[PDB]
Amino acid sequence: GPLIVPYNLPLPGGVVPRMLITILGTVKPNANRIALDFQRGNDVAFHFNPRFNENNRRVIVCNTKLDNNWGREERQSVFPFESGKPFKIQVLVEPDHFKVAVNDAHLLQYNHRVKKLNEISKLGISGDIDLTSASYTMI
Ligand SMILES: OC[C@H]1O[C@@H]([Se][Se][C@@H]2O[C@H](CO)[C@H](O)[C@H](O)[C@H]2O)[C@H](O)[C@@H](O)[C@H]1O
Ligand SMILES: [Cl-]
Ligand SMILES: [Mg+2]
After folding, report:
1. Residue 90 annotated as binding site
2. Domain locations along the chain
């Protein structure tokens, strides 16, 4: 039941521990990239960036953008997306980190570099996907 990409999901009052964000969709055939951008105004608190061709390898890049400057990248070779295939990304907000799971398997955690979780009020979803659903609940 598509939404059009790029898609902005409002996070009113920011994020809080025990908040679970669920993204359903399908990777396009011959995808180059996916990006989730958790934004505090112009800053990017948490950038989650699967790259399907970085020097002919698949890698997940996580980072934070402060005052338009990217910080130190945390990379992950474990790559559970496939071109043409449906996925579920779950982002669980915990007190000290974002926890990410894809297709019900734990993938990575990302320690909070931005401390004002209550100001992370937008999630940008972009890249080579068909978007079915983006929602949140409290667990
Ligand atoms: O992936 C596609 C793009 O990637 C950036 Se990589 Se530089 C920078 O890195 C940040 C993470 O530290 C963010 O992922 C930015 O979006 C990216 O532009 C490079 O300029 C090119 O390869 C371009 O084609
Ligand atoms: Cl902060
Ligand atoms: Mg295939």
Report:
1. no
2. 7-138
- In angstroms, what is the resolution? 2.0
Comparing CA positions, the residue from 33, 139, 129 lying closest to residue 86 is 129
- Compute the Cα dihedral for 80, 83, 86, 90 and give only its sign: positive
Structure tokens, 72: 């130190």
Alpha carbon 80 to chain centroid distance?
14
Instruction: Say whether domain 7-138 belongs to CATH 2.60.120.200.
Output: yes
82 marked ligand binding residue: no
DSSP string, 107-133: EEEEE-SS--GGG--EEEEEESEEEEE
Q: How far is the CA of 36 from the centre of ligand 3 (A)?
A: 23
The 3-state secondary structure of 93-113, one letter per residue: ECCCEEEEEECCEEEEEEECC
Q: Obtained via which technique?
A: X-ray
CA gap 96, 77 in Å, rounded: 23
6: cis peptide before it, omega within 30°?
A: yes
